[PDB]
Each structure stands twice: as structure tokens, then as C-alpha cells.
Subunit: 376 residues, 2 copies
Amino acid sequence: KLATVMAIGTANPPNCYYQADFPDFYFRVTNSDHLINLKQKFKRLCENSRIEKRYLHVTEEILKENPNIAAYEATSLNVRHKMQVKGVAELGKEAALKAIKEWGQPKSKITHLIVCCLAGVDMPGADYQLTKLLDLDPSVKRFMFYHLGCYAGGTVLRLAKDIAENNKGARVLIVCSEMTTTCFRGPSETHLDSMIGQALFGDGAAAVIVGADPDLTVERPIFELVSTAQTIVPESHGAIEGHLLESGLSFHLYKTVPTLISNNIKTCLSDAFTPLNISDWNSLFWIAHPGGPAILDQVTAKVGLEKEKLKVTRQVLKDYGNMSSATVFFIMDEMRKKSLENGQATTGEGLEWGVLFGFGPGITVETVVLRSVPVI
Amino acid sequence: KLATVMAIGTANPPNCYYQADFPDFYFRVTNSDHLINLKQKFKRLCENSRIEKRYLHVTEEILKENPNIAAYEATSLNVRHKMQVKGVAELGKEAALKAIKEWGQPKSKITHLIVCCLAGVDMPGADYQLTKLLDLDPSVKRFMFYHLGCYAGGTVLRLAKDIAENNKGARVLIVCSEMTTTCFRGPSETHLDSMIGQALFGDGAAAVIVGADPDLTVERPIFELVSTAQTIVPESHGAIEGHLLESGLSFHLYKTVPTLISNNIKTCLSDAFTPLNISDWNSLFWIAHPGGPAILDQVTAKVGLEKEKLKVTRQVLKDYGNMSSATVFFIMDEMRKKSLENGQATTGEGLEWGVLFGFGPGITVETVVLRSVPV
């Protein structure tokens, strides 16, 4: 009996930022208007990001009250951290309550809690905070992950699968709460890397319930976790790095990232599906972390995917931007919603087998083989 | 077939600090000799710590070159992080190589890697670094835990047990590498508890191999992981806290910690052993995180343990100080060594069942039921 995702809930900050208006907002609040040429590159960057809007905790008021955050590099960890710690917990609670509602069981049945946050280090951590906020059993077995990054959506499922399958009756609550307040910062002409993050990253939290052997009279399976794997892409050292400094979390990205990832995807697919006698990549439903539009385009081309294979993935990127580890769950959620609306036979666009990909620092690739569930 | 610890290796920085000389050293290098009353308080903390020596990366030279680290509160995260990241990887590598040697199998057989560090956040992290340093399979399945604290020794075993038991043939390498460069700072008259950290915390790394269904023709089991649990001590909110700030990792410890832990430990014992029909706490071998001398004294008295039941735990505290998550493994390592030297029948001082306790921020208590292996 495979570990199964039985519920998904999501949340985002109330501040919506349309990408079409971001360049002006961003350069205005960071006092970079005098950098005309730099703003031209950023504008094109946003225009080609394939992101229509994002939800961010940051506001003009917050920046006015904390100018060191708006600076490309100024001591500001303490102020960022204060908001980061409070925000990840609040957003996480909202998503968790929505997942618990869909699950249909009382929260007292939750036996394990996995919390994943890009940033917001605290001791005790967000797992402790959420256990208190949600009033979970004090003996809930917790796992807290700080600073993993965008591949973590796969990491938490990999962990949840083993917990649920080795502990009879175990019901795992997963919460990936991502906030970019820790990394928001002004532009730098000598560091075009950081600028990319300012155009692609958005805030959001996703929560899911995972368990093996569902009680079908109350629980309702969405996707089954068949197998999981993690690997480091060859010759990718230093391509994606993040450092926690006195000025917050930094972001460094090689231009080779899309090429490095796309060129290795077929290897990940082969390792994951050969044991299952599957070789047709178009026969699978796809849930891939949208690091950027370039990555989706390259994966599609190199893998040989039909043009609409990553439709849901692209829709989430368009509607929310890159929300790090939480993103794949927003995609998972929308996929079963769209499948139902299209009257398809399974939660996976009517297909039986699928794959979920998490990409991040390493470069690390998390590969999760999924199985859809029948839909009436 | 239960997940089993099949190897343990440890490492420590080369700089040894005798506790008897630490008060003078600490107040001298932090330029606090004029604070006579504060010094007497620190002196007593060190004298009552029951710690004889500790190994630390920090040196007088490093403090001289970095006044912002010696200061109680000065912007210094960047410089602390630089050393912290290098240190955890280096100590971790040394401990891991020792564990791999004892294990008896080639490192290419490691399928999972769990790394736990009090501090040193980096992306990619220490798990990625160790994979490269040890030249492990690039497809090794990794888990990286930053900023958990002193209860984490239990946490990593709790994780390793489920990994090993749900994946046939899985062999898990665990590395708990703790460095205090991130939290070392001068004393504060307004925050008297902050210096408790400079009196008790030492550096060290421990690595262990965990796997189910041992191939007895090559692997040699040490302890079996029977069951795991984690809980939050009632009414303990805010007793143990740590915040990663511009001045590094802060340390806050309330005076209620010893009693909060000792007065609730029987509950953890009952929850773990009632299912095993065990109620005599002295019939078990004990491996407890030595958060401090008071915790060990109170647990012994309140649980009704024989005076020498925690002998090994106290010896490790004496020889290395509190090394956060790595500590319980140093204790586990020494217990099986003493058991052999004392001609006892099992790795657990001749006893069959045992318990390992991790204590930390929460207050969180990790309870791991162990079973010894014949010697």
C-alpha cells in the first residue's frame, strides 16, 4: 500500500503584484530610477518571465520603514528575520487548515509534521510554532527543514512516503511555506544574478496530507507516491547558490542552469521509469517545478514533450510566479481541479502514470513517480 | 527486521581547553576582567558544569583578529559563517571516514545521507558538501537539518529508522557535525544566561551507519533502534531558545529547564516502555543528552536510577562538554567500548534494553528505545 496524497491546501500573501507594473514599482522603491539602462534589462526580464502576477509580503510601506531591505546590500537580517518568522507561520497555518478540511479527519489524527521553509531559522522552529498554532498533538513527530530551496517539494514527499509506509496508521501533515522577504533587495549592475530572483520569485504556502492505506469511507486519495529519487546533476557545481548573510539571503544563478537541468532530465526519467517498463515520456502527466520559463522550454524540447504537457505548470507560474518548494503542490492542486472540470478519468489529466520534479541548489533534482487515482 | 546502528565514528577540533583554566581565558580574551561579579558567576558555572575539557575551533588568535566575535553583540554573522561552513564539513568528513571504516562496506554502498548541523546554513548545504568530499554516489538520497539543536541526535535516528526499514538494502550515513563558532560571544551582565553557552558547549562531530537486515558476514551490529518518539514538555514554552541574528546565533536558557525535563521524563519512559511491558528504569542502559549537570542529577534522583547508571553519559560530558546533537553518539560509542573492556555480555553494559534521550528547544524530548547486541 503506497503513501498517498489525500489533501492539498494553499495560501498566499494578500498583496498582489502584476508583473506588467513591477519594473516601475521595483525601481521606484529601491531608488534605482537613475539606472535607466539597468531598468531596461529588468523590464525585458519581467516581460519574458511568463509570470502575470505574484503575491508578496513586501509592501512599499515596509520598505519605507526598513530602507536597508531595499538596498542591494545593507545589514538587515534582523528586521527581515522578524517578518520572515512570523510570515511563514501565518501562511503555513492558513494552508494547513485548508488541507485538513479537505482531508476530512480531525487534526488529532495527525501523527507527523514536516515543515519546510526557504528561510526563517528559529529555535524552536516553524514546526513547533505550527504545532502550537494548529493545536496538534504535542507528541506529533516533527521534521523541520530550513534553507533547502526549490527542490524541496520532492524532498518532503520522499520523506513522507517512508514515514507513512513504515508506520501503520501514520498521517503526515506537510507544510512548505515560502516567503521572499529574506531575499528581497535592490538591483546591482555588477550582479545581474540577484535581479533575476526579484523578477521570478513569489510567496506562497502549500500543505498536504500523506498517508498509506486510506479509509475510503472518509479519506479521498489524489495521487499515489510510487518511488522517489534525488541526484546531483553532473558538472553543475556552483550553478545555483544561496548564502545567508547580514544583508539577508543572497541569490546566485549561472546562465547555464536551464541547459544543465534539461540535459539531465532524460537520465532521471530513465532511472525512474525503466524499472516500470515505461519509456514514452508523453504518456505521463507532468508536475515540474517552474524555476523559470527557459527551463520549461528546454525540458519540453529536449525530452520531446507535446506542447500542452506542461500546461498546468505554466499556468501556475503565470498566476503565482516561482514559489520555491511550495510550487509543485499548487500545480498538483490545479491539475486535479482542471482534470475534473475537463471530465477526465483520473486526477492526472486522465493518464495513469506521472512524474513530479523538484529542481534546486546542487544542482539537485528530486524525481517522484506518481500514480493518478480514478475519478468518476 | 529493525534498523540497526552498525558503526560510529567521531572527531573534534585540535584545540583543547581545560575547564579549570577557561574562566581566566574567557574573561581575558573578551576583555571583561574588570567585571568581577560577572567573572565569579562564570567561574562557578564552569566549576559546577562537571566538564573537564572541551575542543573548540575558536582560538585566541581568531578572537584577536575578529573583535566582533569576541563582543557580546556585534555584527559578525558573515565571518562566523565562513568558518562554520568549513568547520562542519571538515569535522564531518573525519568522523564519517571512521564510521565507514568500522562499518566494513565500501562507501559506494551508502544509499542515504542525513546531515545535522546546529548552524552553518548554506545552499547547497553540508549534505551536498560531504557527498562531494567523501565522493559518495551522486544519487545518494540526502536530508539536511540546520538549527535543530540538542535533541537532534534522537531526530536523525528517528529518520534513519524509517528510511532503513522501508527501503530494502538501504544503508544510511548520519553525520552530526557541531561547531560553536556561530554562537561564541562575550558575556553580558544583562543577559546572564547567554554565557552559560560558553561554559558548556564544545565542538565535535559524530557519524553513524544505520541499516536493517545486517549481512552478518561483513557488518557488525552495535545497537538496534526499537522505537522512536518526540514530544513537547508541557508548560515549557520559551525555556530554550536560539535566534540567528546579525551577531550570530544567540542563546537563551531559563532556570526552569532542569526541573521541566526531570519532572516529565517518567512520562516519556512510560509511553515508550509500557508497550514493552517494562517498568524498571534501572533495568535499562541509559544514553542521555548531557545538557548540563543539573539535568543528569535530577533525572537520576527523580527517576530513581542507581548512582552509576549515567556513568558513561557523565564521562563524555567530562571529556568533551556538551556537543549538541553529536553528544549522544559519543556516549553510545563509549558505552560499547566500556562494555567490552568490562567483559560484559552486551554493548549496553550487559543489559538487553536501553533508552536514548535527546533534549532541546521546545522543550523537545526525543525518546529512542534501544536494544543492545551481544559482545
